[PDB]
Amino acid sequence: GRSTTLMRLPKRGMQGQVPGEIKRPRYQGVNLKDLARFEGEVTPELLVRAGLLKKGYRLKILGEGEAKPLKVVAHAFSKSALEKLKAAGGEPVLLEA
Amino acid sequence: LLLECTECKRRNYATEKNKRNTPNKLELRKYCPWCRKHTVHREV
Amino acid sequence: TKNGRDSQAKRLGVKRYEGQVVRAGNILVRQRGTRFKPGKNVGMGRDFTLFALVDGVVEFQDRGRLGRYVHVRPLA
Amino acid sequence: PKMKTHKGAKKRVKITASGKVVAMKTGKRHLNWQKSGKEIRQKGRKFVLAKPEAERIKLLLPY
RNA sequence: CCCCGUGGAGCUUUACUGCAGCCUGGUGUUGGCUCUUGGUCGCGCCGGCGCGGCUGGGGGCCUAACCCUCGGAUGGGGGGACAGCGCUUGGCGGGCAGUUUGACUGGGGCGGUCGCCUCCUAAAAGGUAACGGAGGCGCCCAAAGGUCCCCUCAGGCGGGACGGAAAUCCGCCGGAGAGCGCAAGGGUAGAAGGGGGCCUGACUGCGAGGCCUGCAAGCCGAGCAGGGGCGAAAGCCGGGCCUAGUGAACCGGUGGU
RNA sequence: GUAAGAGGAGGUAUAGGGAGCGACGCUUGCCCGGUGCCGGAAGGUCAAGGGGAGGGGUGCAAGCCCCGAACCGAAGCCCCGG
RNA sequence: GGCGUGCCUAUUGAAGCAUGAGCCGGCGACUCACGGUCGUGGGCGAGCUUAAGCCGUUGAGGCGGAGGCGUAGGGAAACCGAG
RNA sequence: AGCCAUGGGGGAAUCUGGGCGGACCACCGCCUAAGGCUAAGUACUCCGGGUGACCGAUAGCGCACCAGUACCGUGAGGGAAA
RNA sequence: AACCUGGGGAACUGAAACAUCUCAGUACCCAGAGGAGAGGAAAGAGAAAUCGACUCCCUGAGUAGCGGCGAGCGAAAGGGGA
Ligand SMILES: [Mg+2]
Ligand SMILES: [Mg+2]
Ligand SMILES: [Mg+2]
Ligand SMILES: [Mg+2]
Ligand SMILES: [Mg+2]
Ligand SMILES: [Mg+2]
Ligand SMILES: [Mg+2]
Ligand SMILES: [Mg+2]
Ligand SMILES: [Mg+2]
Ligand SMILES: [Mg+2]
Ligand SMILES: [Mg+2]
Ligand SMILES: [Mg+2]
Ligand SMILES: [Mg+2]
Ligand SMILES: [Mg+2]
Ligand SMILES: [Mg+2]
Ligand SMILES: [Mg+2]
Ligand SMILES: [Mg+2]
Ligand SMILES: [Mg+2]
Ligand SMILES: [Mg+2]
Ligand SMILES: [Mg+2]
Ligand SMILES: [Mg+2]
Ligand SMILES: [Mg+2]
Ligand SMILES: [Mg+2]
Ligand SMILES: [Mg+2]
Ligand SMILES: [Mg+2]
Ligand SMILES: [Mg+2]
Ligand SMILES: [Mg+2]
Ligand SMILES: [Mg+2]
Ligand SMILES: [Mg+2]
Ligand SMILES: [Mg+2]
Ligand SMILES: [Mg+2]
Ligand SMILES: [Mg+2]
Ligand SMILES: [Mg+2]
Ligand SMILES: [Mg+2]
Ligand SMILES: [Mg+2]
Ligand SMILES: [Mg+2]
Ligand SMILES: [Mg+2]
Ligand SMILES: [Mg+2]
Ligand SMILES: [Mg+2]
Ligand SMILES: [Mg+2]
Ligand SMILES: [Mg+2]
Ligand SMILES: [Mg+2]
Ligand SMILES: [Mg+2]
Ligand SMILES: [Mg+2]
Ligand SMILES: [Mg+2]
Ligand SMILES: [Mg+2]
Ligand SMILES: [Mg+2]
Ligand SMILES: [Mg+2]
Ligand SMILES: [Mg+2]
Ligand SMILES: [Mg+2]
Ligand SMILES: [Mg+2]
Ligand SMILES: [Mg+2]
Ligand SMILES: [Mg+2]
Ligand SMILES: [Mg+2]
Ligand SMILES: [Mg+2]
Ligand SMILES: [Mg+2]
Ligand SMILES: [Mg+2]
Ligand SMILES: [Mg+2]
Ligand SMILES: [Mg+2]
Ligand SMILES: [Mg+2]
Ligand SMILES: [Mg+2]
Ligand SMILES: [Mg+2]
Ligand SMILES: [Mg+2]
Ligand SMILES: [Mg+2]
Ligand SMILES: [Mg+2]
Ligand SMILES: [Mg+2]
Ligand SMILES: [Mg+2]
Ligand SMILES: [Mg+2]
Ligand SMILES: [Mg+2]
Ligand SMILES: [Mg+2]
Ligand SMILES: [Mg+2]
Ligand SMILES: [Mg+2]
Ligand SMILES: [Mg+2]
Ligand SMILES: [Mg+2]
Ligand SMILES: [Mg+2]
Ligand SMILES: [Mg+2]
Ligand SMILES: [Mg+2]
Ligand SMILES: [Mg+2]
Ligand SMILES: [Mg+2]
Ligand SMILES: [Mg+2]
Ligand SMILES: [Mg+2]
Ligand SMILES: [Mg+2]
Ligand SMILES: [Mg+2]
Ligand SMILES: [Mg+2]
Ligand SMILES: [Mg+2]
Ligand SMILES: [Mg+2]
């Protein structure tokens, strides 16, 4: 009826810019606890091919759970998850060119 | 009056209020910056 | 006229009473001056606000000449 | 037909993974001058809303 | 009729903002010759003379654009690079257009008021209304702040060269009736008051826990860390006895990582 | 009326447009500070534009690109008078 | 003989000297679409689900994973990640 | 504040040409303006037909009936009943 | 009849006033096209050394952005199809 409760205030620094969104490689967090879910050679192709990736340009394995000894390719790992599995199997890193 | 203190040989301000004609043309009180600690503060 | 003017109510008084448990920091009493005084485990601040300095029960001392004090008698 | 998100709110309020609504504290952009270090230090952080918090969420929608 | 509605419409103007119109600079339409002041580059010549492109301004004359006109004219005459028209510049602009022109209110208008602090009203928690009764605020201070140390008032009576109703001084009584920047209040000398010495914590990073509260806001705050200040030290310092001295958000200014 | 054009007028200051007053008689005083209008080749401010000292971005460079002081620039307003 | 102030509306208050209505019949007012959010009946489950469309049928369904929601948050961001 | 388009002013080059990739510059890369044409997939429903958890004469089209009629309006136009 | 394209083009209304903004390039007026009309073989996309005319549906997406950053408005590339 009055001055709204948008007395609050844009922090969202970087709201926009005429041509707007800047294309740039985004990473999909996937835990190696949902990795235990199988055995073979886990790769971006696979995690999205069925489950928990979904076209999110970049795979990043990380975090909770216990690492099944196996190869696991991805675009990036957790300082923590690199360990988890590096202490029981192969960590192969992303593409380059 | 609007008075904004400044750090020597650096960059850091402070909340202040100088007085108009009142005896106060230059101020030189100490304080405590973020980078390192404690350094003389001139007006400007 | 030239009247009908006033300042909003300041809601001051004894906030905790004798024999209430209280945590640290609890405002004990809000006051116009030193209508009360600090004492045992009870600090006071710019406005004269008195407040617990450790959890425990509150009690009120009258001391005539010396004035009235408030304390927390701690325990745990 | 498809409510449109309220950009004004998007631009100034997050809805937290549990369900809270966070905002930057008002009062820290020019009333400013001499206000305790405490004063404007305290203004530095986010808070949590309440009943309008629900009002708030209603807009941020496909969001 | 009267009031009310963030209703309508006609009218007004030195309400606001446009629009027509009108004034205007540059420029396109837009050309020739000539005189003279300023610039411009090369040369001849000791800042100045001579020359051409470029010129900018100003004067004059031309005619063929453009305009008017003449017993119809591929022409004569008059005006003439102006005017007119195109784009653009700034102006004036109720001729016209869209609108704005607050609320409270013992009806509305007029008057008064509108946020903040103090007291009363307020019924011994808190909170309470009225166009109820009364007063303040929109600041001030680098010393009026920190800390260490030291001292304690106003007033009444007696006494003292000027002066005594009241300066300054000695005495005796004098618990607070002084002071505490400013209103009022609550507080207060077992200082928060007066004076000193050193000083700048009118710090950065934070913040357990509460007061208050519809929301947003306001308020208090131990303690942790960093690096400091005064103190022998216990300790005290995150401005000022406290409670007013103010303004969401947007948009923008300055400086930084 | 956007325009072409028309009305004015197939008129020409003894005319035409606007304004106010309103046969006729006698008369119509003072005040230009404000407002309007009229005049004022000075001055003051004043837009585009011209100008380019000076500064910038980038490139290895030749460059390209941008910012910009003085100074020249109408009407209007100011100013001066009726 | 006892008792007894129409109906609706609107109101602090209406039999009210407040509103509406001559009477009867018929017409007459909380819908749908998309998207939200709770709840509820059910299918599946770290998964769940298809849109256009294609094929079928001519009151028959099936195919179709593009895509969406979920499986990680925090920060303005770079980024880091059970923090 | 680029790109596309263009009312005003200035005004090129012909592949060592030009344009674009969001001011600008350098790099890298994309495309070839200032001539034109091109089916299908798409839109609609006066018309014909088929179907309806569509109406059943105050409904359904305004019109099941001789209705855009009667009647009403200068007219645009309104517009039944049955 | 409606559909379509080009030229022109409102206001109520929303913003709880209103002027930017919205309504909306909608209503309508005008010219033209036709069984459709438009568009159409890159001086394209935009970040992949990728795509490969145009139109239509699904999606992308109420995202990117636009905005008195109010009210609101609101793409594209890509992917699935015709
Ligand atoms: Mg208001
Ligand atoms: Mg009152
Ligand atoms: Mg303290
Ligand atoms: Mg204090
Ligand atoms: Mg303090
Ligand atoms: Mg959940
Ligand atoms: Mg900070
Ligand atoms: Mg979404
Ligand atoms: Mg109102
Ligand atoms: Mg009104
Ligand atoms: Mg000359
Ligand atoms: Mg000239
Ligand atoms: Mg000349
Ligand atoms: Mg001549
Ligand atoms: Mg001639
Ligand atoms: Mg001549
Ligand atoms: Mg001829
Ligand atoms: Mg002549
Ligand atoms: Mg309007
Ligand atoms: Mg009123
Ligand atoms: Mg009255
Ligand atoms: Mg008044
Ligand atoms: Mg009271
Ligand atoms: Mg009381
Ligand atoms: Mg209370
Ligand atoms: Mg009450
Ligand atoms: Mg002093
Ligand atoms: Mg003093
Ligand atoms: Mg005496
Ligand atoms: Mg001191
Ligand atoms: Mg807290
Ligand atoms: Mg707290
Ligand atoms: Mg503390
Ligand atoms: Mg310390
Ligand atoms: Mg130290
Ligand atoms: Mg202390
Ligand atoms: Mg003091
Ligand atoms: Mg605003
Ligand atoms: Mg703004
Ligand atoms: Mg500014
Ligand atoms: Mg004529
Ligand atoms: Mg004529
Ligand atoms: Mg004539
Ligand atoms: Mg005549
Ligand atoms: Mg006479
Ligand atoms: Mg006269
Ligand atoms: Mg002169
Ligand atoms: Mg230079
Ligand atoms: Mg350089
Ligand atoms: Mg260089
Ligand atoms: Mg050079
Ligand atoms: Mg010059
Ligand atoms: Mg001039
Ligand atoms: Mg002039
Ligand atoms: Mg009756
Ligand atoms: Mg009645
Ligand atoms: Mg009535
Ligand atoms: Mg009836
Ligand atoms: Mg009646
Ligand atoms: Mg629904
Ligand atoms: Mg470009
Ligand atoms: Mg052009
Ligand atoms: Mg680029
Ligand atoms: Mg290059
Ligand atoms: Mg048919
Ligand atoms: Mg049919
Ligand atoms: Mg019928
Ligand atoms: Mg019948
Ligand atoms: Mg029929
Ligand atoms: Mg008739
Ligand atoms: Mg259409
Ligand atoms: Mg409106
Ligand atoms: Mg409204
Ligand atoms: Mg409305
Ligand atoms: Mg059109
Ligand atoms: Mg045809
Ligand atoms: Mg066809
Ligand atoms: Mg065709
Ligand atoms: Mg064509
Ligand atoms: Mg071609
Ligand atoms: Mg093309
Ligand atoms: Mg290829
Ligand atoms: Mg606003
Ligand atoms: Mg739009
Ligand atoms: Mg098909
Ligand atoms: Mg189809």
Overall description:
This is part of a larger assembly, with chains A (97 residues), B (44 residues), C (76 residues) and D (63 residues). Chain A has helices at residues 44-49, 79-86, and strands at 27-31, 41-42, 58-62, 71-72, 76-77. Chain A is an alpha/beta fold. In chain A, the strands form two sheets. A three-stranded parallel β-sheet of chain A has the order 1-3-5. Chain A has a two-stranded parallel ribbon with strand order 2-4. Chain A is elongated and about 60 Å long. The N and C termini of chain A lie far apart (59 Å). The radius of gyration of chain B is 11 Å and the shape is elongated. Chain C contains no helices and seven strands. In chain C, 21% of the residues are buried. With 63 residues, chain D is α+β, with helices and mostly antiparallel strands. In chain D, a hairpin with a 5-residue loop joins strand 1 and strand 2 (21-24). Chain D starts with 6 loop residues before the first helix and ends with a helix. Chains in contact: A-D, B-D. Chains A and D meet through loops of A and helix 1 of D. The structure holds magnesium ion (86 copies). Chain C binds five RNA strands through strand 1, strand 3 and strand 5. Chain D: Belongs to the bacterial ribosomal protein bL35 family. Chain D: Keywords: Ribonucleoprotein, Ribosomal protein. Chain D: GO terms for molecular function: structural constituent of ribosome. Chain D: InterPro entries: Ribosomal_bL35, Ribosomal_bL35-like, Ribosomal_bL35_CS, Ribosomal_bL35_sf. Chain D: Pfam families: Ribosomal_L35p. Chain A: One of its GO terms (cellular component) is cytosolic large ribosomal subunit.
Number of strands of chain A: 5
The general outline of chain A is elongated
The main sheet of chain A comes to: 3 strands, parallel
Order of helices and strands of chain B: EE
Which small molecules are bound?
magnesium ion
Cα gyration radius of chain A (Å): 19 Å
Contiguous helical run count of chain B: 0
Strand content of chain A: 15-25%
Helix content of chain B: under 10%
Number of E-type strands of chain B: 2
Question: Looking across the biggest beta sheet of chain A, what order are the strands in?
Answer: 1-3-5
Question: What's the assembly state of these chains?
Answer: part of a larger assembly
* Helical proportion of chain A, percent range: 10-25%
Biggest sheet of chain B, strands in spatial order? 1-2
**Major interchain interface with per-chain residue totals:** A-D, 9 and 12 residues
* SS field, number of helical segments of chain A: 2
PDB class: ribosome
Keywords: 70S, ribosome, IGR, ires, psiv, CrPV
Entry title: Crystal structure of a complex containing domain 3 of CrPV IGR IRES RNA bound to the 70S ribosome.
Chain A: 50S ribosomal protein L15
